[PDB]
């Protein structure tokens, strides 16, 4: 049967077990594909989705084995032997077809509710790359042929929106656990693997105990398994110390034999030191803080009848944690797929977004979704953060400082813990550490500064605000059942409530407001909304503390926490006064932009292998569709001898610091957290040293960039667009682009490349081919397409300038807006023609939603050697009528490139009438 509708058609296949399939049409380059074995296509309400305004036209016609439907920009072809749908654009060129019978639905029986775990496969090509499906830890920038599972956690990220070189997008509507790749996820070691211990005995690997180096017992072990919590009962007693010295040591020692050739993957999950070698071979070598263990994956080729020696080397303190697992090799007829899978829903519902480049791709998510709301201008500028400013002098102290070195600073933030010991949840404030909180903030604004302040979802169940929300049945109640106590003092009974109803966002948002919005806070610091309920819990321990919520399990919406959660403070910060509201969210999720959320990469550590994984996090992220995202410059959390301030490890921890400070100015929010040590410029390395003069100097150029970066910023509202970018974005032709993991574009002018190696004066950087490059810091011109060793002491990064490039800057400044009227400087750096409507507003309320907005067109004519200054359109309060314009040109070396006061070539006074100014 087809049967036609207003907005698409319905096809029953006519194979036995096929499942009915429904397409609708969202807009001309945007179809919904729904499969349902029942044929009704029922499902709960979306989440992620808001309304789409789109041209809903179609045209159908019937032909044998296939139904058409034909738009305006796509042709969608659906079998009627067995639904499978194929996609192809206004040309009739192929883009993307599902595989012919690749449908899989399972029954899934938990929490009194009957789901399906559903897997949708697609026919994909050796040289498809893939982007996006949230922020991750492995350092990937090509998610081809990887897998990749979205399960909230501390520091990864879920959004299951993916982008292909293949000129489309995917938004992939299920909110439970999903995969991406093997459908299975990993395995236990031996499900698998044939294992030898250390004397050829077949069956366990040999595992032994050691308290300080020293041997305590050893035995035959099948799995490497202290994985969560409940995984350390098995731990031997005897080999357990709590002293507040001492430490852990454990190895595994034996042989692994695959049972079917091909590409083995494998993750090492683990805490504190970790050590893999595989036939002698160093393949992990990682340290963690001991209550944040995470993924660290690694693949083989091996092939069956052949031992592989492996050895795992464990130094811990109590509690860390570790497993070794393993995924074997799909069969070959699904190996090269495209494949999607979801523990827990209804039906497969995803949406095509065609897409005619990476930009589109990002567009598509947002009409789906929302579009991204408009932050502060001030958000922009410099954060300073700790964990944590223990008193309100501490506090207002580092901002005074900040002010009495000229340094630029815009944000402060209060950190957990201000509140009474025994009182997490009532939003209170201890008065021997924080006497005075109005004062505290009046103080921070005096000194032209925002403050933020940590709110958690956590409540302890003495305060008031817990039986509120208790006695209206928002709390979830497992976790103060089974009396879990936190880390706080003696440790404290608690919970998270649930943020899904709005009834339950009401109450939530009432106690913030009376409590803390009534002080004059600027903006919400959203932490641990996972949610992070306890940590290291096994998977289903943290479904039944979540569970169940005010739409049904925590199964079926084990990633969607964070998007009700922040609606309900961005609403009703929204409606108490008419300035834009900002939320620093440790999850993002399908639609969080809506809802003025900016996001972190949560609490990785003070290590050179996560500030070179950040890179390709970032680049997935503003892939998946959230353009507001920053992390802890540093680092969060430290190992002791950076802690203890060992001075035998100071100048390592001083270079880590300076190089991730110097990345850190050129991602979209720049921000300094973190543990003990200080993070403050001058408590990193005093005046004098390298380090010091490194971080001032990006400091303040962050300054002098701000109107080029809050174009960018503008541009995420207006044009759906991004800020930090992969090089795919802008180079889609480029093959050697793809998989580069340690170099972006800031915006569409800055290529960066951070240096993460101890020592290092110099890097390479690859250059994409079809663009002249210029040095930032030289103004030497290097052709595209080559690797070049790049200058990098320890005082500056790598940066080059796309040829064509125009960039508004103005002056150095301690604030934003600190000089009002300041006069604006247009850089031009030469050698290919160029474009850039520089986007300004108030920066502070939501005019720009009724079209309270101006933009300049600046048009760079390479042959002429002309600026075109274009008609001004548009005007908002605080617009300057009349405005003093430089302008200065970069064609090649330059004494004072990359100064932060440069001197300029022309300068002319701009009224909104085209201007035009010759660099001859
Ligand atoms: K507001």
Same mark, same amino acid.
């Given at each position: 049967?087809?049967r036609?509708?207003?907005?698409?058609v319905?096809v029953?296949?006519?194979?036995?077990?096929?499942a009915?399939?429904?397409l609708?049409?969202?807009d001309a380059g945007?179809?919904?594909?729904?499969?349902?074995?029942?044929?009704?296509?029922?499902?709960?309400?979306?989440?992620?989705?808001?309304?789409?305004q789109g041209?809903?036209?179609?045209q159908v016609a019937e032909?044998g084995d296939?139904?058409?439907?034909?738009?305006?920009?796509?042709?969608a072809?659906?079998?009627?032997?067995?639904?499978?749908?194929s996609?192809?654009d206004?040309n009739?060129?192929?883009?993307l077809?599902?595989?012919?019978?690749?449908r899989?639905?399972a029954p899934l029986?938990?929490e009194g509710?009957?789901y399906?775990?559903?897997?949708?496969?697609?026919?994909?090509?050796?040289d498809e790359?893939?982007?996006?499906?949230?922020?991750h830890?492995?350092?990937?920038?090509?998610?081809?042929?990887?897998?990749?599972?979205?399960?909230?956690?501390?520091?990864?990220?879920?959004?299951?929106?993916?982008?292909?070189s293949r000129?489309?997008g995917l938004?992939w509507?299920?909110?439970s656990?999903?995969?991406l790749?093997?459908?299975r996820?990993?395995?236990?070691?031996?499900?698998?693997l044939?294992?030898y211990?250390?004397?050829g005995?077949?069956?366990a690997?040999?595992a032994?105990?050691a308290?300080?180096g020293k041997?305590?017992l050893?035995?035959?072990?099948?799995?490497?398994?202290?994985?969560?919590?409940?995984?350390?009962?098995?731990?031997p007693?005897?080999?357990?110390?709590?002293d507040?010295?001492?430490?852990?040591?454990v190895?595994?020692?034996?042989?692994?034999?695959?049972?079917?050739?091909?590409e083995?993957?494998?993750?090492?999950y683990?805490?504190e030191?970790?050590?893999?070698?595989?036939?002698?071979?160093?393949?992990v070598?990682?340290?963690?803080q001991?209550?944040?263990?995470?993924?660290?994956?690694?693949?083989?080729?091996?092939?069956?009848?052949?031992?592989?020696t492996?050895?795992?080397?464990?130094?811990?303190?109590?509690?860390s944690?570790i497993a070794?697992?393993?995924?074997?090799?799909?069969?070959a007829?699904?190996?090269k797929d495209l494949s999607?899978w979801?523990?827990?829903?209804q039906?497969?519902?995803?949406?095509?977004?065609?897409?005619?480049?990476?930009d589109?791709?990002?567009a598509?998510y947002?009409?789906l979704?929302?579009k991204?709301?408009?932050?502060p201008?001030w958000?922009?500028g410099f954060?300073?953060?700790?964990?944590?400013?223990?008193?309100q002098?501490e506090?207002?102290?580092?901002?005074?400082?900040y002010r009495?070195?000229?340094?630029?600073?815009?944000?402060?933030?209060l950190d957990?813990?201000?509140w009474?010991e025994?009182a997490?949840?009532?939003?209170?404030?201890?008065?021997?550490?924080?006497?005075?909180?109005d004062?505290?903030?009046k103080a921070?604004?005096?000194?032209?500064?925002?403050?933020m302040?940590?709110?958690?979802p956590?409540?302890?169940?003495?305060?008031a605000?817990?039986?509120?929300?208790?006695?209206?049945?928002?709390?979830?109640?497992?976790?103060?059942?089974?009396?879990?106590?936190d880390?706080?003092?003696?440790?404290?009974?608690?919970?998270?409530?649930?943020?899904?109803?709005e009834?339950a966002?009401?109450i939530?948002?009432?106690?913030?407001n009376?409590?803390l919005?009534?002080?004059g806070?600027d903006?919400?610091?959203?932490?641990?909304?996972?949610?992070?309920?306890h940590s290291?819990?096994?998977?289903?321990?943290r479904?039944?503390?979540?569970?169940?919520?005010?739409?049904?399990?925590?199964?079926?919406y084990?990633?969607?926490?964070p998007?009700?959660?922040?609606?309900?403070?961005?609403?009703?910060?929204?409606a108490?006064?008419?300035?834009?509201?900002?939320?620093l969210?440790?999850?993002?999720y399908?639609?969080?932009?809506?809802?003025?959320?900016?996001?972190w990469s949560?609490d990785?550590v003070?290590?050179?292998?996560?500030?070179?994984?950040?890179?390709?996090?970032?680049?997935?992220?503003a892939?998946?569709?959230?353009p507001n995202?920053?992390?802890?410059?540093?680092?969060?959390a430290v190992?002791?001898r950076?802690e203890?301030?060992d001075?035998?490890?100071?100048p390592?921890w001083?270079?880590?610091?300076?190089?991730?400070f110097?990345?850190?100015?050129?991602?979209?929010?720049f921000?300094?957290?973190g543990?003990?040590?200080?993070?403050?410029?001058?408590?990193?390395?005093?005046?004098?040293?390298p380090?010091?003069?490194?971080?001032?100097?990006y400091?303040?150029?962050?300054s002098?960039?701000?109107?080029?970066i809050?174009?960018?910023?503008?541009?995420?509202?207006?044009?759906?667009?991004?800020?930090?970018?992969?090089?795919?974005?802008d180079?889609?032709?480029?093959?050697?682009?793809?998989?580069?993991?340690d170099?972006? &574009? @800031?915006?569409? =002018?800055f290529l960066?490349? /951070?240096?993460?190696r101890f020592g290092?004066?110099?890097? +390479? !950087?690859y250059?994409?081919?079809?663009?002249?490059?210029?040095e930032f810091?030289?103004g030497?011109?290097?052709?595209g397409?080559?690797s070049?060793?790049?200058?990098?002491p320890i005082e500056?990064?790598? &940066? @080059?300038?796309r =040829?064509?490039?125009?960039? /508004?800057?103005?002056?150095?400044?301690?604030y934003?807006? +600190? !000089?009002a009227?300041?006069?604006?400087?247009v850089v031009?750096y030469?050698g290919?023609?160029?474009?850039?409507?520089?986007?300004?507003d108030?920066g502070?309320?939501?005019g720009?939603?009724?079209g309270?907005?101006?933009?300049?067109?600046?048009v760079w004519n390479?042959?002429?050697?002309?600026?075109?200054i274009?008609?001004?359109?548009?005007?908002?309060?605080?617009?300057?009528?009349?405005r003093?314009?430089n302008?200065?040109?970069?064609?090649?070396?330059?004494?004072?490139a990359?100064?932060l006061?440069?001197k300029?070539?022309?300068?002319i006074?701009?009224?909104g009438?085209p201007?035009s100014?010759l660099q001859?």
């Amino acid at each position: 049967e087809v049967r036609k509708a207003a907005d698409g058609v319905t096809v029953v296949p006519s194979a036995k077990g096929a499942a009915p399939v429904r397409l609708q049409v969202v807009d001309a380059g945007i179809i919904r594909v729904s499969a349902d074995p029942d044929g009704d296509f029922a499902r709960s309400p979306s989440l992620m989705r808001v309304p789409v305004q789109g041209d809903t036209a179609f045209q159908v016609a019937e032909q044998g084995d296939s139904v058409q439907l034909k738009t305006g920009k796509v042709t969608a072809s659906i079998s009627t032997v067995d639904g499978h749908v194929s996609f192809a654009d206004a040309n009739g060129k192929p883009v993307l077809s599902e595989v012919a019978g690749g449908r899989s639905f399972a029954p899934l029986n938990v929490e009194g509710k009957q789901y399906l775990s559903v897997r949708q496969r697609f026919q994909s090509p050796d040289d498809e790359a893939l982007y996006g499906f949230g922020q991750h830890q492995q350092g990937w920038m090509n998610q081809k042929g990887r897998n990749v599972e979205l399960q909230q956690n501390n520091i990864d990220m879920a959004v299951p929106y993916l982008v292909s070189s293949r000129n489309y997008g995917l938004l992939w509507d299920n909110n439970s656990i999903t995969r991406l790749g093997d459908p299975r996820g990993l395995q236990p070691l031996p499900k698998t693997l044939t294992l030898y211990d250390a004397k050829g005995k077949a069956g366990a690997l040999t595992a032994r105990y050691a308290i300080n180096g020293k041997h305590i017992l050893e035995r035959r072990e099948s799995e490497v398994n202290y994985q969560y919590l409940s995984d350390l009962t098995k731990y031997p007693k005897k080999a357990i110390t709590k002293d507040k010295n001492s430490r852990m040591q454990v190895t595994w020692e034996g042989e692994i034999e695959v049972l079917t050739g091909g590409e083995h993957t494998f993750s090492l999950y683990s805490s504190e030191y970790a050590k893999l070698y595989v036939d002698g071979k160093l393949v992990v070598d990682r340290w963690r803080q001991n209550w944040n263990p995470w993924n660290h994956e690694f693949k083989l080729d091996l092939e069956p009848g052949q031992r592989h020696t492996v050895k795992v080397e464990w130094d811990l303190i109590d509690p860390s944690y570790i497993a070794l697992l393993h995924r074997d090799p799909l069969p070959a007829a699904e190996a090269k797929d495209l494949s999607l899978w979801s523990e827990a829903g209804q039906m497969i519902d995803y949406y095509f977004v065609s897409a005619d480049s990476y930009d589109q791709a990002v567009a598509g998510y947002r009409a789906l979704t929302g579009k991204s709301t408009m932050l502060p201008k001030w958000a922009y500028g410099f954060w300073q953060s700790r964990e944590r400013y223990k008193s309100q002098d501490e506090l207002v102290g580092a901002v005074a400082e900040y002010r009495k070195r000229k340094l630029s600073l815009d944000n402060i933030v209060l950190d957990w813990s201000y509140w009474p010991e025994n009182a997490w949840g009532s939003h209170d404030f201890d008065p021997q550490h924080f006497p005075d909180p109005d004062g505290m903030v009046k103080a921070v604004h005096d000194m032209h500064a925002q403050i933020m302040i940590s709110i958690w979802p956590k409540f302890y169940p003495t305060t008031a605000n817990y039986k509120e929300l208790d006695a209206a049945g928002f709390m979830f109640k497992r976790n103060v059942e089974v009396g879990e106590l936190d880390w706080i003092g003696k440790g404290y009974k608690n919970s998270f409530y649930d943020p899904y109803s709005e009834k339950a966002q009401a109450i939530y948002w009432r106690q913030i407001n009376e409590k803390l919005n009534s002080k004059g806070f600027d903006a919400w610091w959203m932490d641990a909304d996972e949610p992070d309920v306890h940590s290291n819990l096994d998977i289903a321990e943290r479904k039944a503390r979540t569970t169940p919520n005010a739409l049904g399990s925590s199964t079926e919406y084990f990633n969607s926490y964070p998007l009700p959660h922040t609606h309900g403070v961005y609403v009703g910060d929204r409606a108490a006064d008419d300035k834009r509201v900002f939320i620093l969210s440790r999850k993002g999720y399908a639609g969080t932009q809506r809802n003025a959320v900016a996001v972190w990469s949560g609490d990785i550590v003070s290590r050179w292998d996560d500030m070179r994984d950040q890179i390709s996090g970032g680049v997935n992220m503003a892939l998946s569709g959230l353009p507001n995202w920053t992390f802890d410059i540093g680092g969060f959390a430290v190992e002791k001898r950076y802690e203890d301030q060992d001075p035998a490890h100071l100048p390592e921890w001083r270079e880590l610091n300076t190089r991730w400070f110097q990345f850190g100015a050129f991602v979209p929010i720049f921000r300094s957290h973190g543990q003990f040590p200080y993070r403050e410029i001058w408590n990193i390395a005093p005046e004098g040293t390298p380090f010091y003069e490194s971080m001032a100097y990006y400091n303040r150029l962050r300054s002098a960039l701000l109107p080029y970066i809050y174009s960018l910023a503008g541009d995420t509202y207006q044009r759906d667009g991004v800020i930090m970018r992969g090089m795919m974005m802008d180079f889609p032709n480029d093959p050697k682009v793809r998989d580069i993991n340690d170099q972006y &574009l @800031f915006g569409p =002018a800055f290529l960066v490349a /951070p240096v993460t190696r101890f020592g290092a004066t110099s890097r +390479q !950087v690859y250059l994409p081919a079809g663009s002249s490059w210029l040095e930032f810091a030289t103004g030497k011109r290097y052709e595209g397409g080559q690797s070049i060793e790049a200058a990098a002491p320890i005082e500056r990064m790598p &940066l @080059f300038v796309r =040829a064509g490039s125009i960039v /508004p800057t103005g002056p150095v400044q301690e604030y934003v807006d +600190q !000089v009002a009227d300041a006069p604006l400087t247009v850089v031009v750096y030469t050698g290919a023609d160029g474009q850039f409507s520089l986007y300004e507003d108030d920066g502070k309320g939501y005019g720009y939603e009724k079209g309270e907005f101006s933009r300049i067109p600046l048009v760079w004519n390479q042959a002429k050697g002309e600026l075109s200054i274009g008609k001004r359109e548009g005007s908002w309060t605080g617009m300057q009528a009349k405005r003093t314009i430089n302008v200065r040109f970069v064609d090649g070396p330059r004494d004072d490139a990359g100064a932060l006061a440069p001197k300029t070539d022309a300068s002319i006074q701009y009224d909104g009438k085209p201007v035009s100014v010759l660099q001859r």
